[PDB]
Structures are given as structure tokens and as C-alpha cells.
């Protein structure tokens, strides 16, 4: 009735996915094998797990998500891991020789190799599904298939269904921290082929995960376990409406042309809170106002792009748990109140409340403390264009020096893809350039 499905790519990406399905399975508490601890009573009023966990004729409830990546080592760990009763073989599609972070390889070269298997799996699930709203696709501009092969993936999947929503979680090159140097190539080559195949998607950067887990989670020494846990929470709440009763169970498609008013600049930030320790869970109270005012801390901004340097457009503060329409509401007045913040005035307010009544659940072994209320500030501003500009300037020079270009030209891409894709970020620079212009008079 209300389905979504997750797709996983790139090393960090399927790392995220593993964390996620660990999470949801924890949260509905269905045991890793595929059974719930106990029988399910027959009831109505709304869906349940049925969105994602797959009903069998018995205690076998597998996700509705798919793995695809050409670097097949790690995924085997899932193939080995505790959830080897959880998942399902045909759920698993991997490539042996990954891209080597040639975008053009797993996009072009090995792009040709596994696509059809992917699409068949997609047809099996969507055919298995009925009211699948949209598509959860995860990848990374690092684990190279996460850029290339995913690029073809949406490039064709969109042309397959279209009417489904594109739920885009991919990681963005951290501003000064990194993984490689061809990242310019991965990213921008992705981007010009990303945009028109993307509906909307958010940009998760890691350095924020570090700084904030270390200060706010009080973390001393983190890694992808903590990161994947954190994105696990954020996606855990970004879709609760289709999973749990909330006052305004807003929906993705609902989000689509309302958060991203124009068609073009359709990405965003997301600073979840309240992430604190057990020793800050106590020694604190964690007000709605604390999560709320705290929600707009630029230093809390969960992607390393200063909001205060940008002007907000929309903010879908979907809330978990014991939320009051009034209290949050006045907090939103407080958000109108913030002098430092500046909004795409031709969109004076574009707010859209989310009050889901389940407060958050915590993953044992985790660092986040337990609370009563969650916020997701999926918000869109002018600010985020800048780091892009760093990307196209860095890539600008490096590409000017023809660095690495032999690698890509060797695999079947043309140079005008490069300069033209730079025209692509040129245009989007005109977009964040223009939409931020205040309409005259």
C-alpha cells in the first residue's frame, strides 16, 4: 500500500545500508533470522513493517531493498553476517572487479555488466509491491560504483517507472577531508548525469559526523560504525509517517515539489538531534525548544556548509514522540524570529509539520542517549552552492592539468562530458545564484 525500497552501492554506502536494516529490524524488533519473537495480531487502520520487511507464509520477513556494487568483498560479510538468515540470496547482486573509482568504468565499462540483473530484481520487488511510493537509493561518490553504476541505475530506473519518488542518500566529498583526489571526477561526472535523473536527495558529509559525535555524542574515536549508526537514525525518522501514527503523517511525494519549490536545486541539509550521552541524557531535560532552537544551530548543521551563509527555503521538522502542535508551533514562530536567518522571501514560509507520536528507539551498543522527541530538519537554503564551487574549482584546475584523464578517456568517456559537466555546475551555480536573488520591487 505504502512501499519504499532501498538500494545500496559504494563501500560506505552499503555500510550505511547494513546499519539501516539492522536498525529497522531492531525497531520493529523482528529477530534477525526473519521472525518476530511472537505472533502478529490481525488489525487495521494503517500498515506496519509490510512496507519493507517482507511477509512470508511464516516467520521470514525480509527487507524490500537491494544491494548492488562491483566491489563484492565486504557485502559477503553480510553474506556471512548474523543476518544471513535475514536477507535473501537474490537480494544480493555484486560485481567482482569494482570501478577502481573510475566513474566511467562501473558506469560505462562495468556499467554494462550487471544492469539487467539489477532491473530484473527491481521488477521482482515492485511487482511484489503495490503502492510503492518511491525509491531508496544509496551510494557514494567514493566506492566508485556508488557514483558510476548508480548513475546509470537511476538513469534507467527513472525511465522505467518514473512516477515513483527518488529518495536519494549519497555521500558528498567532505570539504577538506577526503578519500581520493579523482573525487572531482566522480562527483561532477555524476552530477550532470545525476540531476536530471534525480528527483531529490540529501548530501551527507562525514566531518560533521565526526565533530558532532565527538562533541554531542561525546565520542572519542569514531568510524563508519558510528556514522552508519547516525544516518541510520536520520533515515529511521525520515519515513516514520508511513510506519507509525503521527499527527501530520506527511509523505515523500508530499515533500517533493514543496520542499524543493523549483525543479532544479532539489537537495538539502539534515541536522538530526537530539544526540547526547547517557551522562547528558541526565544532567539534561531536552525540551522541544531545545531540540528546536538546537535544530538550527549552524554548528549543529549535519553537513559542512554554513546555513548562516545561506538563506533557508523550507524546513520539514518531522518529530518523533510526545510533540505538541502548539509548542513546536511557537518554536516555529521563534524560527521566524531568528534575525540571522533569511528566507527565500518569495517563499515566505514553506513549513510543513511532522509530529509522529513514537519517540525514538535506541540501538544497544550505541552512543546516542535515549530521549522522547526527535527532529529532522530537512531544510533547503542558498548556502550549499559554495562547497560545490570548491568542487568545480579544485576539479577545475586538476582537470585543467589533464590529471588522471587518461584513466577515464581510456574507458570510454569524451572530453566534452567534462567541460560540459562543468557547464552543468555552471548552470546550477546560476541557480543558487538566481533563486537567492530577491525578487525586485
Amino acid at each position: 500500500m505504502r512501499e519504499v525500497i532501498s538500494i545500496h552501492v559504494g563501500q560506505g554506502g552499503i555500510q550505511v545500508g547494513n546499519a539501516c536494516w539492522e536498525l529497522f529490524c531492531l525497531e520493529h524488533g523482528i529477530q534477525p533470522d526473519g521472525q518476530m519473537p511472537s505472533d502478529k495480531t490481525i488489525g487495521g487502520g494503517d500498515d506496519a513493517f509490510n512496507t519493507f520487511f517482507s511477509e512470508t507464509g511464516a516467520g521470514k520477513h525480509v527487507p524490500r531493498a537491494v544491494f548492488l556494487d562491483l566491489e563484492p568483498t565486504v557485502i559477503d560479510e553480510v553474506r556471512t553476517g548474523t543476518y544471513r538468515q535475514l536477507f535473501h540470496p537474490e537480494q544480493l547482486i555484486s560485481g567482482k572487479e569494482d570501478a577502481a573509482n573510475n566513474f566511467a568504468r562501473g558506469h560505462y565499462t562495468i556499467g554494462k555488466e550487471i544492469v539487467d540483473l539489477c532491473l530484473d530484481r527491481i521488477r521482482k520487488l515492485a511487482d511484489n509491491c503495490t503502492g510503492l511510493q518511491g525509491f531508496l537509493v544509496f551510494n557514494s561518490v567514493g566506492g566508485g560504483t556508488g557514483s558510476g553504476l548508480g548513475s546509470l541505475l537511476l538513469e534507467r530506473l527513472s525511465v522505467d517507472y518514473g512516477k515513483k519518488s527518488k529518495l536519494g542518500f549519497t555521500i558528498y566529498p567532505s570539504p577538506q577531508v577526503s578519500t581520493a583526489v579523482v573525487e572531482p571526477y566522480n562527483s561532477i561526472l555524476s552530477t550532470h548525469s545525476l540531476l536530471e535523473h534525480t528527483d531529490v536527495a540529501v548530501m551527507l558529509d562525514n566531518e560533521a559526523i565526526y565533530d558532532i559525535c565527538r562533541r554531542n555524542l561525546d565520542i572519542e574515536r569514531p568510524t563508519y560504525t558510528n556514522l552508519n549508526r547516525l544516518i541510520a537514525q536520520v533515515i529511521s525518522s525520515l519515513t516514520a509517517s508511513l510506519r507509525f501514527d503521527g499527527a501530520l503523517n506527511v509523505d515523500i511525494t508530499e515533500f517533493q515539489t514543496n520542499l524543493v519549490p523549483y525543479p532544479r536545486i532539489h537537495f538539502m541539509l539534515s541536522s538530526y538531534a537530539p544526540i547526547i550521552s547517557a551522562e547528558k541524557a541526565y544532567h539534561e531535560q531536552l525540551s522541544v525548544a531545545e531540540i528546536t532552537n538546537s535544530a538550527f544551530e549552524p554548528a549543529n548543521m549535519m553537513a559542512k556548509c554554513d546555513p548562516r551563509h545561506g538563506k533557508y527555503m523550507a524546513c520539514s521538522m518531522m518529530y518523533r514522540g510526545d510533540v505538541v502542535p502548539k509548542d513546536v508551533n511557537a518554536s516555529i514562530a521563534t524560527i521566524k524570529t531568528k534575525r540571522t536567518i533569511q528566507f527565500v522571501d518569495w517563499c515566505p514560509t514553506g513549513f510543513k509539520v511532522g509530529i509522529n507520536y513514537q519517540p525514538p528507539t535506541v540501538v544497544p551498543g550505541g552512543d546516542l542517549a535515549k530521549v522522547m522527541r526527535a527532529v529532522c530538519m530537512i531544510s533547503n537554503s542558498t548556502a550549499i552552492a559554495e562547497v560545490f564551487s570548491r568542487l568545480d574549482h579544485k576539479f577545475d584546475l586538476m582537470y585543467a592539468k589533464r590529471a588522471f584523464v587518461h584513466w577515464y578517456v581510456g574507458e570510454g568517456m569524451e572530453e566534452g562530458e567534462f567541460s560540459e559537466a562543468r557547464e552543468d555546475l555552471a548552470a546550477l551555480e546560476k541557480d543558487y545564484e538566481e533563486v537567492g536573488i530577491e525578487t525586485a520591487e
Binding site: 494503517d46 499527527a247 505538541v324 502542535p325
Partner: protein, 429 residues
């Protein structure tokens, strides 16, 4: 029999009517199961004009469910009194409007209207002398308005004699629960000014103000709020439901309320409203509740009588009293603040009484007066629509529905026309 029906869409409104029928059940004291457990035939006398007996005495509503996604259908389907329903009416959607009103009006609007208007029509045959029906949604989106626009058009044509008393939620000036509100709203209100017979304004912030200040409550939700409003919307048919030494129906009301058909957006006042201690401060008199009646703080709408002028004013009284008081306070008040009483409408205040108040209280008051203060309401919402329509902000979600902008101009200079229209009537003597 002047019986009527209910139809609800609306992100909230679907909940609203749930509370509403809930309340009426209380005033009819029939079990959740659907049989009567009360103490006077009077609850049974006029029971039909909202309810419907069933074979075996299943007593049922004349309600119509609107929704574009079954969750609400499950929700109220999970509702106490849920066994007091008919499974037939659970007419919902598989998609949701996403509140682009064109989506809920063309896309899904045209998609699911048919099954509704059919079964509703089967209810139309179920109605002997249908006084009307009650629609409910919100005027800012599509979860209700998406289709409810089509309802008002279709049934309005299909039943050009029936009353269409329309309550839908108005976006408060301060808090924008969505930014596509000016557009859904304006596109709707173009329709509603043409097609709807009665309308009363549904703000949230007023209801907050009532709960927090005058209710002295800290914890606001919807459900209490729908209690506060279904109190009034439940009062409205009281005489029509029960005897009254001074009775007046919706036809007598609107015809006795509206000078010209474009003025069926009405504001609302209901009372008393206390917290528990208050009774041990104060007691109940007709003059007392009168002293609440003309309270801007009970003025549950974005319009200010303190700023605008009462084009019309009326009182809905349920209880047992002396009208010799009632009128006396009436005229007294019609003098006391004459200036906010429009001039050439002599005795612009008008009266009523129901022999029984609502349950639990001894006397009832209701005020659905109509000033023209709403002009700031339309002016605001039209203004925001103006700004982002300069920007075309989220036109792409919009034109993706395949409407034209010229429609936006139509509801635009339209709605401005209605505003200035109220200006001249307010500015005249």
C-alpha cells in the same frame, strides 16, 4: 425530514468528524455498538435527521468519508464508536494528494470522485427531505479541499436545492504549516465563493488561544480542538434536532444571515469556556454568556470584530431560561457597541433558543456572526500567494499537475474582488 449527511476529507477534518459524530452519539446516549441506552425518546424523536436505524437497531451515521490514503480510514476505523459505523462509507485513496491541490482535484481528483458520488447518491435516495449535509476539509491544501472542491461542484449541480454548509481549516497568519497553502487556498476559494452555501472559518491559532488562555490549558492537540468546534457545529442543528420556543433552521439562519450570497464565510463563538476552578469563581447567566458572546477571544477566526464591523450577528441558545432576559441582553448589546454594528441592518442581531442545552451544561450559547474583518485574512493569504507567484515558487510541483496560471489569476483578481466587495459594504451607510 431536514435530515442531513456528513462528508469529510482533510488532513485533520477526517479526524474532526470522527470527534463530531462521537459527540452526537453522546448527546444521543446510544451505545458504541449502535443501540440506544438513553432515557428520553427525545433523543430518538429526531434521531434520524442525523442517524439511521438499521435492521436490528444498528444506529448509523449519514456520514461520508473522504481520503486519499487509508490511514485515517484505519485510524477512525480504530476508533471508539467504530462499531457504530457502516463499513460501506470507508471511501479513501491509494495515493494521497501530496497537497498539490491540482493533484487532489484533477489527478486524484478525477480518479476517485465517482465511487464517492455514487454511494453518496445512494445516501441521497436514503434521505427523505434532505435539509443538507456537512462537508469538512481545510482551505490550504488538498487532503480535503483537493476533492472537496469537486464535491461541492458535483453535488451542487446534482442537488441545486440542498444546503452546503462548509467548514474548512484556514491557515493562520503566523504559522505556515505549508507554503503551498496560498495556492491551494486561492484555487479552492475561487470555487467556494461560487459553489458553497455556508462557510465558517477554521483557524488553529484561535483554538490554541482558547485552550491556553481561556481554557487555561497547556497541552494542545487536535482532538480537544475538534471537541471545541464540534461542540458548535453540533449545536447548530439543535432546534432542528430538538424543540425550541424560538427556532430557526439553516435556511432561516442563512437567509436570516446573508444579504448577498457572497458572504457565507462566517465566524464562530461558542461558550462557556472555563477551566475547572472557574465555576467557583463564577456562575451562569444569559447576560454572562452574552458577555462572552462578543468576545474577540472567543472570536475563533482570523478576523477581528474589534477592527471590522458586524455585518451580521446571531445567537444560538440551548437551555431553559427566560427569553425576556435573552432579547433584553440582545438589544442591550446591539446598542452598547453600536459602532461595530453595521448601520442599515436594523436589528442586525437575531435570536434563537433550544429547550434543551447540550448535555452537561444547563444553558448554551453560540455566535456565528459575520463582520467583514476577514478582509485581512484574504489580503494576507493573497499576499503570500502574490509574493511567491512573483517567484513562481513551487510552480513546478504545480504546473507539473498541468493547470494554467491564468486560473491563478482567476481566483486572484477574483478573491481580491470579493475583498473589495466587502470593503464597499463595510464602507457604506
Amino acid at each position: 425530514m431536514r435530515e442531513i449527511v456528513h462528508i469529510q476529507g482533510g488532513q485533520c477534518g477526517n479526524q474532526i468528524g470522527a470527534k463530531f459524530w462521537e459527540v452526537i452519539s453522546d448527546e444521543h446516549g446510544i451505545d458504541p455498538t449502535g443501540t440506544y441506552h438513553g432515557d428520553s425518546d427525545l433523543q430518538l424523536e429526531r434521531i434520524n435527521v442525523y442517524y439511521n436505524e438499521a435492521t436490528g437497531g444498528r444506529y448509523v451515521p449519514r456520514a461520508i468519508l473522504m481520503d486519499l490514503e487509508p490511514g485515517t480510514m484505519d485510524s477512525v476505523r480504530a476508533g471508539p464508536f467504530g462499531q457504530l459505523f457502516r463499513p460501506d462509507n470507508f471511501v479513501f485513496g491509494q495515493t494521497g494528494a501530496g497537497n498539490n491541490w491540482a493533484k487532489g482535484h484533477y489527478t486524484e481528483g478525477a480518479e476517485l470522485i465517482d465511487s464517492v458520488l455514487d454511494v453518496v447518491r445512494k445516501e441521497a435516495e436514503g434521505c427523505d427531505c434532505l435539509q443538507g449535509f456537512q462537508i469538512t476539509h481545510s482551505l490550504g491544501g488538498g487532503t480535503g479541499s483537493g476533492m472537496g472542491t469537486l464535491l461541492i461542484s458535483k453535488v451542487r449541480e446534482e442537488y441545486p436545492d440542498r444546503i452546503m454548509e462548509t467548514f474548512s481549516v484556514v491557515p493562520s497568519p503566523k504559522v505556515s504549516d505549508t507554503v503551498v497553502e496560498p495556492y491551494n487556498a486561492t484555487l479552492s476559494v475561487h470555487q467556494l465563493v461560487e459553489n458553497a452555501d455556508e462557510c465558517m472559518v477554521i483557524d488553529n491559532e484561535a483554538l490554541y488561544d482558547i485552550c491556553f488562555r481561556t481554557l487555561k490549558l497547556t497541552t494542545p492537540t487536535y482532538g480537544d480542538l475538534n471537541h471545541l468546534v464540534s461542540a458548535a457545529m453540533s449545536g447548530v442543528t439543535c432546534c432542528l434536532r430538538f424543540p425550541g420556543q424560538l427556532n430557526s433552521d439553516l435556511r432561516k439562519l442563512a437567509v436570516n444571515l446573508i444579504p448577498f450570497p457572497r458572504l457565507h464565510f462566517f465566524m464562530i463563538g461558542f461558550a462557556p469556556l472555563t477551566s475547572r476552578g472557574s465555576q467557583q469563581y463564577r456562575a451562569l447567566t444569559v447576560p454572562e454568556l452574552t458577555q462572552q458572546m462578543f468576545d474577540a477571544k472567543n472570536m475563533m477566526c482570523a478576523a477581528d470584530p474589534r477592527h471590522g464591523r458586524y455585518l451580521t450577528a446571531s445567537a444560538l441558545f440551548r437551555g431553559r431560561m427566560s427569553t425576556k432576559e435573552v432579547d433584553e441582553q440582545m438589544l442591550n448589546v446591539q446598542n452598547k457597541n453600536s459602532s461595530y454594528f453595521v448601520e442599515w441592518i436594523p436589528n442586525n442581531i437575531k435570536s434563537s433558543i433550544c429547550d434543551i442545552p447540550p448535555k452537561g451544561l444547563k444553558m448554551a450559547v453560540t455566535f456565528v456572526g459575520n463582520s467583514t474583518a476577514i478582509q485581512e485574512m484574504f489580503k494576507r493569504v493573497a499576499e503570500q500567494f502574490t509574493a511567491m507567484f512573483r517567484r513562481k515558487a513551487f510552480l513546478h510541483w504545480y504546473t507539473g499537475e498541468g493547470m494554467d496560471e491564468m486560473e491563478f489569476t482567476e481566483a486572484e483578481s477574483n478573491m481580491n474582488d470579493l475583498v473589495s466587495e466587502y470593503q464597499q459594504y463595510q464602507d457604506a451607510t
